[PDB]
Design a protein around this ligand. Structure first.
Ligand code: ZN
Ligand code: ZN
Lengths: 192, 9
């Protein structure tokens, strides 16, 4: 009744067991480039991301303007004082992210499916975000579901702690996951 | 600090 695959080409995109993807479930624009929160004008000048609000800021537009991308921690002036991307939607709980556990073709109708293992944002755990959390941090739950591959939006990239900081230039779809979160026991375990 | 992309991966 099912034919399982290690990998599947779906709509000219290769999906493989262990891949991480954005998902729009049945029961529930995608801009490449974000605006600077200061000038709102397109530019070749390098744009950095605030650790807190995740807004974009041209280096040359900061006060005082920066020449280089700051190494390590950085927040913008607004967080100092105290259309949406797919990542923005995920982190606001308006779409899902999952790791691909299985892929198969349903024999009865030829439809392709995955077994999704859901990620969860800290806000959606009953105890919520903690001070030590990062804004791009996800937990990998022990919740699973059968989802049609048609419901997959596109890949995201979920990094273990050892590889997260080195992915600082890898774009908007990069997330951190260190822990498995059991939703029933409300407990954490290292993926490591 | 992370950078903002100029194009999708
Ligand atoms: Zn600007
Ligand atoms: Zn900010």
């Amino acid at each position: 009744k099912r034919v399982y695959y290690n990998k599947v080409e779906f709509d000219e995109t290769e999906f493989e067991i262990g891949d991480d993807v954005y998902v729009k479930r049945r029961e529930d624009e995608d801009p490449e480039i974000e605006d600077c929160q200061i000038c709102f004008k397109s530019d070749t000048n390098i744009m950095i991301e605030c650790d807190d609000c995740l807004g974009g800021f041209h280096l040359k537009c900061l006060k005082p303007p920066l020449k280089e991308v700051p190494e390590g921690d950085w927040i913008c002036q607004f967080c100092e004082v105290k259309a949406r991307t797919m990542r923005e939607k995920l982190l606001s709980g308006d779409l899902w992210a999952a790791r691909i556990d299985k892929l198969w073709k349903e024999v009865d109708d030829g439809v392709y499916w995955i077994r999704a293992r859901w990620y969860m944002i800290p806000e959606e755990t009953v105890s919520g975000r903690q001070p030590h959390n990062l804004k791009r941090e996800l937990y990998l739950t022990n919740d699973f579901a059968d989802i049609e591959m048609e419901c997959i939006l596109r890949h995201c990239s979920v990094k273990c702690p050892k590889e997260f900081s080195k992915a600082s230039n890898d774009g908007d779809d990069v997330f951190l996951c260190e822990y498995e979160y059991d939703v029933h026991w409300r407990s954490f375990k290292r993926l490591a | 600090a992370r950078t903002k992309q100029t194009a999708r991966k």
